[PDB]
């Protein structure tokens, strides 16, 4: 199937308290592989997966240089955004950046991304054509003119279609055993009476990889969202993921309800009934 590489960085200003904090992480698919934290002692891009530790010193040095430089650019960018939004030097603000590419089974480029958020909201993003920008507001419009003038799009385009895809292909081969594995969900049901009149049914999916999964309740064959509750998909902490979906159900009516589980590790969807 297809794969993705992503870098996520967060920069957080701390007035009075000195320089902003900057944290970046990299993932292939749903597997983290590097981190950088401006607050920590090392001051290096660090490995967070086994299959990356094999990269040579040139790699660690290049990646360290690139990520430190970005921390400084985004520290200045916070300063600039203050001015654009006429905001005071008193409060804390956040700048977030996402970057990366998707590739198909053949390893060919599918899609690239480069986007920013200020204070948790879209600021500027590269459009899917990788030739133009979306600016979310008037401030972002000022950045968009600058980036147009300086040909930022053509630079990032070349990188996403080249360096990013070539990089993704290398990582997928080095981490083949980890990354090109699919683990299907192990599933079960739980049942708890809430009263004389009602019961909760909880449909579980455990130990699955990648994180993408769908859990849906039906009653008598019909999709149901009334009286249902679905938690966010969550890391087990060992490389796999968990999720559950519950419904509140009249006592003795359990058998009418079915949970349906879709995941790419499954040749056909599973149904569960109490």
């Amino acid at each position: 199937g297809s794969h993705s590489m992503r870098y996520f960085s967060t920069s957080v200003s701390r007035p009075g308290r000195g320089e902003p904090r900057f944290i970046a992480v990299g993932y292939v698919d749903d597997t983290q592989f590097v981190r950088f934290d401006s607050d920590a002692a090392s001051q290096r891009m660090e490995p967070r997966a086994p299959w990356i530790e094999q990269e040579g010193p040139e790699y660690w040095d290049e990646e360290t240089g690139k990520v430190k430089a970005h921390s400084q650019t985004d520290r200045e960018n916070l300063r600039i955004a203050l001015r654009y939004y006429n905001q005071s030097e008193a409060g804390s603000h956040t700048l977030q950046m996402m970057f990366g590419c998707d590739v198909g089974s053949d390893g060919r480029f599918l899609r690239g991304y480069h986007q920013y958020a200020y204070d948790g909201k879209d600021y500027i993003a590269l459009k899917e054509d990788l030739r133009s920008w979306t600016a979310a507001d008037m401030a972002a419009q000022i950045t968009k003119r600058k980036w147009e003038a300086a040909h930022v799009a053509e630079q990032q385009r070349a990188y996403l279609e080249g360096t990013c895809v070539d990089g993704l292909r290398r990582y997928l081969e080095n981490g083949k055993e980890t990354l090109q594995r699919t683990d299907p969900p192990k599933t079960h049901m739980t049942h708890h009476p809430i009263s004389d009149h009602e019961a909760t049914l909880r449909c579980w999916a455990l130990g699955f990889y990648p994180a993408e999964i769908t859990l849906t309740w039906q009653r008598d064959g019909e999709d149901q969202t009334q009286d249902t509750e679905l938690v966010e998909t969550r890391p087990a902490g060992d490389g796999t993921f968990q999720k559950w979906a519950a419904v509140v159900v009249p006592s003795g009516e359990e058998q009418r309800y079915t949970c349906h589980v879709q995941h790419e590790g499954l040749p056909k969807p599973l149904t569960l009934r109490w």
């Binding site: 996520f8 967060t10 944290i23 948790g120 708890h192 966010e232 087990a236 902490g237 519950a246």
Partner: protein, 99 residues
């Protein structure tokens, strides 16, 4: 805008008294990123708790996982305590062996 954390406290594996396991508190969907998360054993804060590196989702909301090795027993109770701007007081969520 600010977004309040969605908080889950669960074990890595289905819990059996006497078998070691990990206790997780996953917080997701929040903004701003400043957050404090403590795990409690019978109301007392657990000393050694790891967490993941700050990351975020498609909608820009942050997520973190805190965790520690542990061996559940019939006697002991566990909770996560989450301290965030959006919350008037810290939210304390008891570990429920089935959520």
């Amino acid at each position: 805008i600010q977004r309040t954390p969605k908080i889950q406290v669960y074990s890595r594996h289905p819990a059996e008294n006497g078998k070691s396991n990990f206790l997780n508190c996953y917080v997701s969907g929040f903004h701003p990123s400043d957050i404090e998360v403590d795990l409690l054993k019978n109301g007392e804060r657990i000393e050694k708790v790891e967490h993941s590196d700050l990351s975020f989702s498609k909608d820009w909301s942050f997520y973190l996982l805190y965790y520690t090795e542990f061996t559940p027993t019939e006697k002991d109770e566990y909770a996560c305590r989450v301290n965030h701007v959006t919350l008037s007081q810290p939210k304390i969520v008891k570990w429920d062996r089935d959520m």
